[PDB]
Amino acid sequence: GRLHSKGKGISASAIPYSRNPPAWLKTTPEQVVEQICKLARKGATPSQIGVILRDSHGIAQVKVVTGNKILRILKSNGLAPDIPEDLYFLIKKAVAVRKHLERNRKDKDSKFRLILIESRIHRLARYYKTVGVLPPTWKYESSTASTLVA
Amino acid sequence: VRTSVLHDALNSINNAEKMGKRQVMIRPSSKVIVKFLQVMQRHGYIGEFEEVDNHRSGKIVVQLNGRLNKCGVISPRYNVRLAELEKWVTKLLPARQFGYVILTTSAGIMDHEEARRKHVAGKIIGFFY
Amino acid sequence: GGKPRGLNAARKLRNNRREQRWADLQYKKRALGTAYKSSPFGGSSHAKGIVLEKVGVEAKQPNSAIRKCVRVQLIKNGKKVTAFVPNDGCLNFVDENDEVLLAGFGRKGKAKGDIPGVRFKVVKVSGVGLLALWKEKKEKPR
RNA sequence: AUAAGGGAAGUCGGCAAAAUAGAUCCGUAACUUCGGGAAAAGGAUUGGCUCUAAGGGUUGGGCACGUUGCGGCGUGCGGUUAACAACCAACUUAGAACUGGUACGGACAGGGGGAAUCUGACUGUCUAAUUAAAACAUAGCAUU
RNA sequence: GCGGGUAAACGGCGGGAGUAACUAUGACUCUCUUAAGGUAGCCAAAUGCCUCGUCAUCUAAUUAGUGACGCGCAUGAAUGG
RNA sequence: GUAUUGGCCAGCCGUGGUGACAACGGGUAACGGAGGGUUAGGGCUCGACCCCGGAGAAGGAGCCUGAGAAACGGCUACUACA
RNA sequence: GGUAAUUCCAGCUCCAAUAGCGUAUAUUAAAGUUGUUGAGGUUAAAAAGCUCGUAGUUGAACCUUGGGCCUAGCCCGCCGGUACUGGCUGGGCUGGGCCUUUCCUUCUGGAGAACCGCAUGCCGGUGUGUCGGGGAACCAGGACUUUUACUCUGAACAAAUUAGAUCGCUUAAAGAAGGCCUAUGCUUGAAUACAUUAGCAUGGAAUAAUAGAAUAGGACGUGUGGUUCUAUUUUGUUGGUUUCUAGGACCGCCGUAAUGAUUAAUAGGGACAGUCGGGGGCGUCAGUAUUCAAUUGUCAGAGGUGAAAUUCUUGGAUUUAUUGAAGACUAACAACUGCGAAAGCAUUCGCCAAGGAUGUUUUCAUUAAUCAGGAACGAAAGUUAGGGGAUCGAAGACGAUCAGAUACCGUCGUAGUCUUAACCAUAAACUAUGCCGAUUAGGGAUCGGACGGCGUUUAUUUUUGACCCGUUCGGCACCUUACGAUAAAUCAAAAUGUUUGGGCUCCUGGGGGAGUAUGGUCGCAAGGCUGAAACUUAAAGAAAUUG
RNA sequence: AAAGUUAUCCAAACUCGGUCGUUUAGAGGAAGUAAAAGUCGUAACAAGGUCUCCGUAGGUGAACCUGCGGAGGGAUCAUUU
Ligand SMILES: [Mg+2]
Ligand SMILES: [Mg+2]
Ligand SMILES: [Mg+2]
Ligand SMILES: [Mg+2]
Ligand SMILES: [Mg+2]
Ligand SMILES: [Mg+2]
Ligand SMILES: [Mg+2]
Ligand SMILES: [Mg+2]
Ligand SMILES: [Mg+2]
Ligand SMILES: [Mg+2]
Ligand SMILES: [Mg+2]
Ligand SMILES: [Mg+2]
Ligand SMILES: [Mg+2]
Ligand SMILES: [Mg+2]
Ligand SMILES: [Mg+2]
Ligand SMILES: [Mg+2]
Ligand SMILES: [Mg+2]
Ligand SMILES: [Mg+2]
Ligand SMILES: [Mg+2]
Ligand SMILES: [Mg+2]
Ligand SMILES: [Mg+2]
Ligand SMILES: [Mg+2]
Ligand SMILES: [Mg+2]
Ligand SMILES: [Mg+2]
Ligand SMILES: [Mg+2]
Ligand SMILES: [Mg+2]
Ligand SMILES: [Mg+2]
Ligand SMILES: [Mg+2]
Ligand SMILES: [Mg+2]
Ligand SMILES: [Mg+2]
Ligand SMILES: [Mg+2]
Ligand SMILES: [Mg+2]
Ligand SMILES: [Mg+2]
Ligand SMILES: [Mg+2]
Ligand SMILES: [Mg+2]
Ligand SMILES: [Mg+2]
Ligand SMILES: [Mg+2]
Ligand SMILES: [Mg+2]
Ligand SMILES: [Mg+2]
Ligand SMILES: [Mg+2]
Ligand SMILES: [Mg+2]
Ligand SMILES: [Mg+2]
Ligand SMILES: [Mg+2]
Ligand SMILES: [Mg+2]
Ligand SMILES: [Mg+2]
Ligand SMILES: [Mg+2]
Ligand SMILES: [Mg+2]
Ligand SMILES: [Mg+2]
Ligand SMILES: [Mg+2]
Ligand SMILES: [Mg+2]
Ligand SMILES: [Mg+2]
Ligand SMILES: [Mg+2]
Ligand SMILES: [Mg+2]
Ligand SMILES: [Mg+2]
């Protein structure tokens, strides 16, 4: 099922069979990218630019409209984040939970939880290191990890 | 996790045939599966098959008409010389007159009977009778 | 069921095998060689000894008899064991200090029949043979 | 103070005396409150003379112009001497050859050790002028 | 005076007869007796008269030493084991 | 130095080498191999011994002659027997 | 075998092998009772209490297929004639060329034919060949080609042995001998395959791994600048220098090109939205009850048991009403209902972090499954230091029953039962049933999210909230049925297993001795983990039938 | 060119001490198995006359008893406004 559970949910999204824009879209690929770059500099992580553009006006899938992937666009325009967003958010969650635990000494379950979060951090960092996005000498030290997020 | 789509396909076919069905569902499709089906057809053991092509992996629908006894898969792909290839036919085939053991070699996959005429050996992938 | 099945997993199967083999009684008996160490016979078939006295032992509950065993002194290591005398009437022939020859019952380290705690039988006395003397094929030397 | 051979056979009792002793290098048990026991037990070297090696300090680094009488400066701008040259200064450590009536911490100075039992946990204190101990005190524990 | 509590308060914590297919012992049982009848432990020990107790070890020889045995004249739990 | 390479040995300078993918050590009633016994197939067990290779002449060391020996139906010395 | 012995000691008769037969020990089959092929793990011996995680094992799909042709070789079938030949658009079978956007790298040298033609021979070409327009095929040499695994064919490799061909030592076990008319002679054999691990070459290119262009540091050009190095022979000889030239390394400018990025797995990770629960931690609020205490009224009994007594009582017991204090616990609601990895979790409210499921035309793109050692958690009881100490109650003291009663019954009662800071790591820790993945039959309930619909109820009222009908996802469960499985009880898994192979981890082999002795390791201790041997025995054990 | 001689090297052999492995004696203490017509009780198998079993702690001549938390392998698959 999932890495740490026995649940078997299947909630997800289904990609339509068609790979062509609808006839009512009438939006060129060139203009959208600059809107993407302004929102990226405005602060949104690549995750929610798609949902905000989808909700606000028109484009549901950026790939079919422009022929290029969203992160690829940001990388080619020099706006890619230094650290991947999923690992960034996982670190932020782990630091905030540790911050709660040192204040609440006898919060007995969160000690068990921290092992799961840190083990997933180590597995994802090992993948990123073995693929080359992060330098091979990068290490996750719990003491100063709070500075990386903010 | 899924470790043998071929094993899943043959198991589902064997179950449906034992249950008297006429059509079967195979979720994953691969080159080994598709090349397996014509080999099945050339001896009359199955009928028409259709593979609908969704963009993910495709599916398989083969049509059965009875006439099929069993179809199994050997999971560890052993290495067999040419001289002892008759040991396997002695092991897991009811008789030499009918039944086929399928091998994979550098010249495509084929049954053990045409493989003997090709004077070639390789790895074992399944059997049917 | 449940064994490793991979194509390069022969190491787990052979290494796991030896420990499991110890669970066999015959294997343990051979491997520790207690017969070479603990058994009265030094892993051999026969042995020679000297009789010291004749003792009678009563059988278990359903039967009722005296089995007429004998005490023997081993030359090899000087320990004391008890042995049986087969056929009938052999006790008269077998005197004290008679240089007997012994063998086993074939029960492989456990008691045989109704005779308790005795594992050996006399084959020869003064090197002539019991059954031959019983059938008067030979005469016991003095 | 010294004594041939024996080495506690003397005596209530090894009382008195003798034996070991510095430094460098090896090696070190049972037990344990894991801090110890431990310098455990038990071994090897130590002179004279002639040499070798190691451990430091101080002063010096290119052009391009302008004042002051070959020099102190004021500057601007390059390179890190593949670390060079001179002078100065006490001791500590390691190694080699030769040498002797085989001796060398040559005087002085300088732990005998091991296997067990009784008793008090330890350091400490008292009958000045016959008893320093198992006696007293101690931290800890409990009660009013 | 009468009636309750209190032992890390002072202190205390027993005798006699029978009984298992040899012999020995007594698991077991009757009996007198009051505040309770020495539990866990330990021992010829600095505490035992009979005593130089009995067995083993150390010695050529040991009233000495050590390890065990326990109806202990008269061991024993903060008078602490 | 050896018939010759080589930490085989003598000096100087670095701090290395093997290991859970089983190192290191303890047992072996262990000379190794060609091979013997037993069979549907897969295996289990034996192999001092007629063929090939290695080591030894009671236990250790040292050496002459000779192309070839650290030899024992060659020598020297100790230990135990005689 | 205890007085008519089918089983002992004898006589008759009979049985098995036969110049051989019995006994002891070792070893193999028997043994699918060691099990890769091929063995059990709900109850017969056996799934670690639970989760994370390292070695180790296993890992989703995707890249040149097909067509049209033509012909060679090689078998086999058939038909007949005749020893035996042709034929059959016979069946193939192995290819070897083609074109389809694909076909096949490359240099030099040797060698050297074919095709057309010639002179002479002849009757339009040839043997001439000491033909030239030649240039199939071969040989000997240079330059490049992802690398492993895998398979086919070769080379090299011991005599003996095994299988195995030949020869009548009178046959045979053996042996490599012998044979032929008549010979003063001739002739032959003394074979062959396998071993099988590692190493050396060749063809095939499926299956299983690996590398390549993304900050272009990418491919090409006889395009053109360079800036570096080398040096054949040619100018008489030698030396020195230069030019052109040939080749090698590196860096620019321009041009050429379809200029370089696979899907988005009912695999996984992350984001977002409305929700859901007795999941966790801290603080706070409430509830009766129990015990104790105070005030108030009366008078002889009150407790408990099959039945009594111990105990409390006019020094007013028990009971009645009001008030106060202390600690523990949250009835009914409460269920074949919910949450958590398990152990476990129920009074109100506030704060803090965490989680599942649903919805989604958000995001990354194999990031994954099980794990030897290793690590976190782990009921109750127990241990070390403080606080608290209502109720029960190990130990203990009394009252009864009984022949005895150190118990069951009744009145008291210490540790403990609560909490703070640290240890212990075992339970029938049970679903006696390991984890991941695929398929297999009908039904109706039910908890959470989403979607559709006819109506009722109701409000500063509509949409929302409550009820009803149908579909779907994810759970805790249940009834019938067997095509299936088991020795059976029984099972939608305990099925898809003699027609036996999806991936991963652990444990058992007749009963006792024994979870014992000893060694090691953790802990203050109690104890935990690992874990034998001597000896003894023919039965223990499981499910069901009749009593 | 012989005996003898000085200094290294290769080194048998002996003495003392340390360590590893095997066999074996030992007062006394404490277990297991078998053979019994032994003594004392009756814990378990029926609701075995107090339902049985598991973990933990204490107590008693002995089987055993009691406290706390679990399990049914139980003597209940089940009780409605
Ligand atoms: Mg996992
Ligand atoms: Mg799923
Ligand atoms: Mg003297
Ligand atoms: Mg003297
Ligand atoms: Mg002396
Ligand atoms: Mg004396
Ligand atoms: Mg005297
Ligand atoms: Mg003195
Ligand atoms: Mg010393
Ligand atoms: Mg000492
Ligand atoms: Mg000197
Ligand atoms: Mg000295
Ligand atoms: Mg003592
Ligand atoms: Mg003192
Ligand atoms: Mg004084
Ligand atoms: Mg004094
Ligand atoms: Mg006593
Ligand atoms: Mg005494
Ligand atoms: Mg005394
Ligand atoms: Mg004593
Ligand atoms: Mg004495
Ligand atoms: Mg003396
Ligand atoms: Mg007294
Ligand atoms: Mg006293
Ligand atoms: Mg006293
Ligand atoms: Mg290393
Ligand atoms: Mg040997
Ligand atoms: Mg041999
Ligand atoms: Mg030989
Ligand atoms: Mg020799
Ligand atoms: Mg020699
Ligand atoms: Mg000789
Ligand atoms: Mg010789
Ligand atoms: Mg079995
Ligand atoms: Mg059972
Ligand atoms: Mg069982
Ligand atoms: Mg279990
Ligand atoms: Mg695959
Ligand atoms: Mg009143
Ligand atoms: Mg409530
Ligand atoms: Mg609820
Ligand atoms: Mg483990
Ligand atoms: Mg607890
Ligand atoms: Mg307390
Ligand atoms: Mg009671
Ligand atoms: Mg009470
Ligand atoms: Mg507690
Ligand atoms: Mg357990
Ligand atoms: Mg479990
Ligand atoms: Mg609705
Ligand atoms: Mg039964
Ligand atoms: Mg004894
Ligand atoms: Mg009972
Ligand atoms: Mg039952």
Short mmCIF file of all heavy atoms in Angstrom, two decimals, chain D residues 25-27 39-44 111-113, chain H residues 16-17:
data_model
loop_
_atom_site.label_atom_id
_atom_site.label_comp_id
_atom_site.label_asym_id
_atom_site.label_seq_id
_atom_site.Cartn_x
_atom_site.Cartn_y
_atom_site.Cartn_z
P C D 25 60.37 3.76 28.97
OP1 C D 25 59.71 4.52 27.88
OP2 C D 25 59.69 3.63 30.29
"O5'" C D 25 60.68 2.30 28.44
"C5'" C D 25 61.31 2.10 27.18
"C4'" C D 25 61.63 0.64 26.95
"O4'" C D 25 62.54 0.15 27.97
"C3'" C D 25 60.45 -0.31 27.03
"O3'" C D 25 59.67 -0.31 25.84
"C2'" C D 25 61.11 -1.64 27.33
"O2'" C D 25 61.66 -2.21 26.15
"C1'" C D 25 62.27 -1.21 28.23
N1 C D 25 61.95 -1.37 29.67
C2 C D 25 62.05 -2.65 30.23
O2 C D 25 62.40 -3.59 29.50
N3 C D 25 61.77 -2.82 31.55
C4 C D 25 61.41 -1.77 32.29
N4 C D 25 61.14 -1.98 33.58
C5 C D 25 61.30 -0.46 31.74
C6 C D 25 61.58 -0.31 30.44
P C D 26 58.19 -0.94 25.85
OP1 C D 26 57.53 -0.59 24.57
OP2 C D 26 57.54 -0.57 27.13
"O5'" C D 26 58.43 -2.52 25.86
"C5'" C D 26 57.37 -3.39 26.24
"C4'" C D 26 57.86 -4.79 26.53
"O4'" C D 26 58.94 -4.76 27.51
"C3'" C D 26 56.82 -5.71 27.14
"O3'" C D 26 55.96 -6.27 26.16
"C2'" C D 26 57.67 -6.74 27.87
"O2'" C D 26 58.17 -7.71 26.96
"C1'" C D 26 58.84 -5.89 28.36
N1 C D 26 58.72 -5.42 29.76
C2 C D 26 58.71 -6.33 30.84
O2 C D 26 58.71 -7.55 30.60
N3 C D 26 58.63 -5.85 32.11
C4 C D 26 58.63 -4.54 32.33
N4 C D 26 58.56 -4.10 33.59
C5 C D 26 58.68 -3.60 31.27
C6 C D 26 58.74 -4.08 30.02
P G D 27 54.37 -6.24 26.37
OP1 G D 27 53.74 -6.88 25.19
OP2 G D 27 53.98 -4.85 26.75
"O5'" G D 27 54.14 -7.18 27.63
"C5'" G D 27 54.35 -8.58 27.53
"C4'" G D 27 54.38 -9.22 28.89
"O4'" G D 27 55.49 -8.70 29.67
"C3'" G D 27 53.16 -8.98 29.76
"O3'" G D 27 52.09 -9.84 29.44
"C2'" G D 27 53.71 -9.18 31.17
"O2'" G D 27 53.82 -10.56 31.47
"C1'" G D 27 55.12 -8.60 31.03
N9 G D 27 55.22 -7.18 31.43
C8 G D 27 55.30 -6.10 30.58
N7 G D 27 55.40 -4.96 31.20
C5 G D 27 55.40 -5.31 32.55
C6 G D 27 55.49 -4.48 33.70
O6 G D 27 55.59 -3.25 33.76
N1 G D 27 55.45 -5.24 34.87
C2 G D 27 55.34 -6.61 34.92
N2 G D 27 55.33 -7.15 36.14
N3 G D 27 55.26 -7.39 33.85
C4 G D 27 55.29 -6.67 32.70
P A D 39 50.48 1.11 42.30
OP1 A D 39 50.32 0.81 43.75
OP2 A D 39 50.12 2.46 41.79
"O5'" A D 39 51.99 0.82 41.89
"C5'" A D 39 52.40 0.88 40.52
"C4'" A D 39 53.62 0.02 40.27
"O4'" A D 39 54.72 0.51 41.09
"C3'" A D 39 53.45 -1.46 40.61
"O3'" A D 39 54.20 -2.25 39.68
"C2'" A D 39 54.08 -1.56 42.00
"O2'" A D 39 54.56 -2.85 42.33
"C1'" A D 39 55.21 -0.54 41.90
N9 A D 39 55.60 0.02 43.20
C8 A D 39 54.80 0.68 44.10
N7 A D 39 55.44 1.08 45.18
C5 A D 39 56.74 0.65 44.97
C6 A D 39 57.91 0.76 45.74
N6 A D 39 57.96 1.36 46.93
N1 A D 39 59.05 0.23 45.24
C2 A D 39 59.00 -0.37 44.05
N3 A D 39 57.97 -0.54 43.23
C4 A D 39 56.86 0.00 43.75
P A D 40 53.48 -2.92 38.42
OP1 A D 40 54.50 -3.66 37.64
OP2 A D 40 52.65 -1.89 37.75
"O5'" A D 40 52.49 -3.99 39.08
"C5'" A D 40 52.98 -5.23 39.56
"C4'" A D 40 52.29 -5.63 40.84
"O4'" A D 40 50.95 -6.11 40.54
"C3'" A D 40 52.93 -6.78 41.60
"O3'" A D 40 54.02 -6.36 42.40
"C2'" A D 40 51.77 -7.34 42.41
"O2'" A D 40 51.51 -6.52 43.54
"C1'" A D 40 50.61 -7.17 41.42
N9 A D 40 50.38 -8.39 40.63
C8 A D 40 50.56 -8.56 39.28
N7 A D 40 50.26 -9.76 38.85
C5 A D 40 49.87 -10.43 40.00
C6 A D 40 49.43 -11.75 40.22
N6 A D 40 49.32 -12.67 39.26
N1 A D 40 49.11 -12.10 41.48
C2 A D 40 49.22 -11.18 42.45
N3 A D 40 49.62 -9.92 42.37
C4 A D 40 49.93 -9.60 41.10
P A D 41 55.51 -6.91 42.10
OP1 A D 41 56.32 -6.72 43.33
OP2 A D 41 55.96 -6.32 40.82
"O5'" A D 41 55.31 -8.47 41.87
"C5'" A D 41 55.00 -9.34 42.96
"C4'" A D 41 54.59 -10.71 42.48
"O4'" A D 41 53.52 -10.59 41.51
"C3'" A D 41 55.67 -11.49 41.75
"O3'" A D 41 56.59 -12.12 42.62
"C2'" A D 41 54.85 -12.47 40.91
"O2'" A D 41 54.37 -13.54 41.71
"C1'" A D 41 53.65 -11.59 40.53
N9 A D 41 53.86 -10.94 39.22
C8 A D 41 54.18 -9.63 38.99
N7 A D 41 54.30 -9.33 37.72
C5 A D 41 54.03 -10.52 37.07
C6 A D 41 54.00 -10.87 35.71
N6 A D 41 54.24 -10.01 34.72
N1 A D 41 53.70 -12.15 35.39
C2 A D 41 53.45 -13.01 36.39
N3 A D 41 53.46 -12.80 37.70
C4 A D 41 53.76 -11.52 37.98
P G D 42 58.16 -11.80 42.51
OP1 G D 42 58.89 -12.82 43.30
OP2 G D 42 58.35 -10.36 42.80
"O5'" G D 42 58.49 -12.05 40.97
"C5'" G D 42 58.44 -13.36 40.42
"C4'" G D 42 58.62 -13.37 38.92
"O4'" G D 42 57.65 -12.49 38.28
"C3'" G D 42 59.96 -12.87 38.40
"O3'" G D 42 60.99 -13.83 38.51
"C2'" G D 42 59.63 -12.51 36.96
"O2'" G D 42 59.56 -13.68 36.15
"C1'" G D 42 58.21 -11.95 37.10
N9 G D 42 58.21 -10.48 37.16
C8 G D 42 58.11 -9.63 38.24
N7 G D 42 58.15 -8.37 37.90
C5 G D 42 58.29 -8.38 36.52
C6 G D 42 58.39 -7.32 35.58
O6 G D 42 58.37 -6.10 35.78
N1 G D 42 58.52 -7.79 34.27
C2 G D 42 58.55 -9.12 33.92
N2 G D 42 58.68 -9.42 32.62
N3 G D 42 58.46 -10.11 34.79
C4 G D 42 58.33 -9.67 36.06
P G D 43 62.52 -13.36 38.38
OP1 G D 43 63.39 -14.47 38.85
OP2 G D 43 62.65 -12.02 39.01
"O5'" G D 43 62.74 -13.19 36.81
"C5'" G D 43 63.80 -12.38 36.31
"C4'" G D 43 63.64 -12.11 34.84
"O4'" G D 43 62.37 -11.47 34.59
"C3'" G D 43 64.67 -11.16 34.24
"O3'" G D 43 65.89 -11.81 33.94
"C2'" G D 43 63.94 -10.62 33.02
"O2'" G D 43 63.97 -11.55 31.95
"C1'" G D 43 62.50 -10.53 33.54
N9 G D 43 62.17 -9.19 34.07
C8 G D 43 61.83 -8.90 35.37
N7 G D 43 61.59 -7.64 35.57
C5 G D 43 61.78 -7.05 34.33
C6 G D 43 61.66 -5.69 33.93
O6 G D 43 61.35 -4.72 34.63
N1 G D 43 61.95 -5.53 32.58
C2 G D 43 62.30 -6.54 31.72
N2 G D 43 62.54 -6.19 30.44
N3 G D 43 62.41 -7.81 32.08
C4 G D 43 62.15 -7.99 33.39
P A D 44 67.28 -11.13 34.39
OP1 A D 44 68.32 -12.19 34.37
OP2 A D 44 67.04 -10.37 35.64
"O5'" A D 44 67.62 -10.09 33.23
"C5'" A D 44 67.97 -10.53 31.93
"C4'" A D 44 67.87 -9.41 30.92
"O4'" A D 44 66.54 -8.84 30.92
"C3'" A D 44 68.79 -8.23 31.18
"O3'" A D 44 70.10 -8.47 30.71
"C2'" A D 44 68.08 -7.09 30.45
"O2'" A D 44 68.36 -7.13 29.06
"C1'" A D 44 66.61 -7.45 30.66
N9 A D 44 65.96 -6.73 31.77
C8 A D 44 65.40 -7.29 32.89
N7 A D 44 64.84 -6.42 33.69
C5 A D 44 65.00 -5.21 33.04
C6 A D 44 64.61 -3.90 33.37
N6 A D 44 63.96 -3.58 34.49
N1 A D 44 64.93 -2.91 32.50
C2 A D 44 65.59 -3.23 31.38
N3 A D 44 66.00 -4.43 30.96
C4 A D 44 65.66 -5.39 31.84
P G D 111 62.39 2.81 50.64
OP1 G D 111 60.97 3.03 50.27
OP2 G D 111 62.93 3.47 51.85
"O5'" G D 111 62.64 1.24 50.79
"C5'" G D 111 62.29 0.33 49.75
"C4'" G D 111 60.86 -0.14 49.88
"O4'" G D 111 60.26 -0.25 48.57
"C3'" G D 111 60.66 -1.53 50.49
"O3'" G D 111 60.74 -1.53 51.90
"C2'" G D 111 59.29 -1.92 49.95
"O2'" G D 111 58.26 -1.27 50.68
"C1'" G D 111 59.34 -1.32 48.54
N9 G D 111 59.78 -2.30 47.54
C8 G D 111 61.08 -2.68 47.25
N7 G D 111 61.16 -3.57 46.31
C5 G D 111 59.84 -3.80 45.94
C6 G D 111 59.29 -4.67 44.96
O6 G D 111 59.89 -5.43 44.19
N1 G D 111 57.91 -4.58 44.91
C2 G D 111 57.14 -3.77 45.71
N2 G D 111 55.81 -3.83 45.51
N3 G D 111 57.63 -2.96 46.63
C4 G D 111 58.98 -3.02 46.69
P G D 112 61.12 -2.88 52.70
OP1 G D 112 60.86 -2.64 54.14
OP2 G D 112 62.47 -3.30 52.25
"O5'" G D 112 60.07 -3.97 52.18
"C5'" G D 112 60.23 -5.34 52.49
"C4'" G D 112 60.16 -6.20 51.25
"O4'" G D 112 61.01 -7.37 51.40
"C3'" G D 112 58.80 -6.79 50.90
"O3'" G D 112 57.92 -5.87 50.29
"C2'" G D 112 59.18 -7.96 50.01
"O2'" G D 112 59.53 -7.51 48.71
"C1'" G D 112 60.45 -8.46 50.71
N9 G D 112 60.14 -9.54 51.67
C8 G D 112 59.99 -9.43 53.03
N7 G D 112 59.70 -10.57 53.60
C5 G D 112 59.66 -11.48 52.55
C6 G D 112 59.39 -12.88 52.55
O6 G D 112 59.14 -13.62 53.51
N1 G D 112 59.45 -13.41 51.26
C2 G D 112 59.72 -12.69 50.12
N2 G D 112 59.74 -13.37 48.96
N3 G D 112 59.97 -11.39 50.12
C4 G D 112 59.92 -10.86 51.35
P G D 113 56.33 -6.10 50.38
OP1 G D 113 55.66 -5.00 49.64
OP2 G D 113 55.98 -6.34 51.80
"O5'" G D 113 56.10 -7.45 49.57
"C5'" G D 113 56.05 -7.45 48.15
"C4'" G D 113 55.99 -8.84 47.58
"O4'" G D 113 56.96 -9.70 48.25
"C3'" G D 113 54.68 -9.60 47.74
"O3'" G D 113 53.68 -9.18 46.83
"C2'" G D 113 55.12 -11.04 47.55
"O2'" G D 113 55.34 -11.33 46.18
"C1'" G D 113 56.48 -11.03 48.26
N9 G D 113 56.35 -11.49 49.66
C8 G D 113 56.41 -10.74 50.81
N7 G D 113 56.23 -11.46 51.89
C5 G D 113 56.04 -12.76 51.43
C6 G D 113 55.81 -13.97 52.12
O6 G D 113 55.72 -14.16 53.34
N1 G D 113 55.67 -15.05 51.25
C2 G D 113 55.76 -14.97 49.88
N2 G D 113 55.60 -16.11 49.19
N3 G D 113 55.98 -13.85 49.22
C4 G D 113 56.11 -12.79 50.05
P C H 16 62.73 -26.97 36.72
OP1 C H 16 62.45 -27.53 38.07
OP2 C H 16 62.07 -27.56 35.53
"O5'" C H 16 62.39 -25.41 36.75
"C5'" C H 16 62.77 -24.61 37.87
"C4'" C H 16 62.53 -23.15 37.60
"O4'" C H 16 63.25 -22.74 36.41
"C3'" C H 16 61.09 -22.77 37.30
"O3'" C H 16 60.30 -22.65 38.47
"C2'" C H 16 61.25 -21.46 36.53
"O2'" C H 16 61.53 -20.39 37.41
"C1'" C H 16 62.51 -21.76 35.71
N1 C H 16 62.19 -22.27 34.36
C2 C H 16 61.83 -21.37 33.36
O2 C H 16 61.78 -20.16 33.63
N3 C H 16 61.54 -21.83 32.12
C4 C H 16 61.60 -23.13 31.86
N4 C H 16 61.30 -23.54 30.63
C5 C H 16 61.97 -24.08 32.86
C6 C H 16 62.25 -23.61 34.08
P G H 17 58.74 -23.01 38.42
OP1 G H 17 58.20 -22.93 39.80
OP2 G H 17 58.58 -24.26 37.64
"O5'" G H 17 58.10 -21.81 37.58
"C5'" G H 17 57.85 -20.55 38.19
"C4'" G H 17 57.56 -19.49 37.16
"O4'" G H 17 58.54 -19.54 36.10
"C3'" G H 17 56.23 -19.61 36.44
"O3'" G H 17 55.13 -19.16 37.21
"C2'" G H 17 56.47 -18.80 35.17
"O2'" G H 17 56.39 -17.41 35.44
"C1'" G H 17 57.94 -19.15 34.88
N9 G H 17 58.06 -20.26 33.91
C8 G H 17 58.49 -21.54 34.17
N7 G H 17 58.48 -22.30 33.11
C5 G H 17 58.02 -21.48 32.09
C6 G H 17 57.81 -21.75 30.72
O6 G H 17 57.98 -22.81 30.10
N1 G H 17 57.33 -20.63 30.04
C2 G H 17 57.10 -19.40 30.62
N2 G H 17 56.64 -18.45 29.80
N3 G H 17 57.29 -19.14 31.90
C4 G H 17 57.75 -20.22 32.57
#
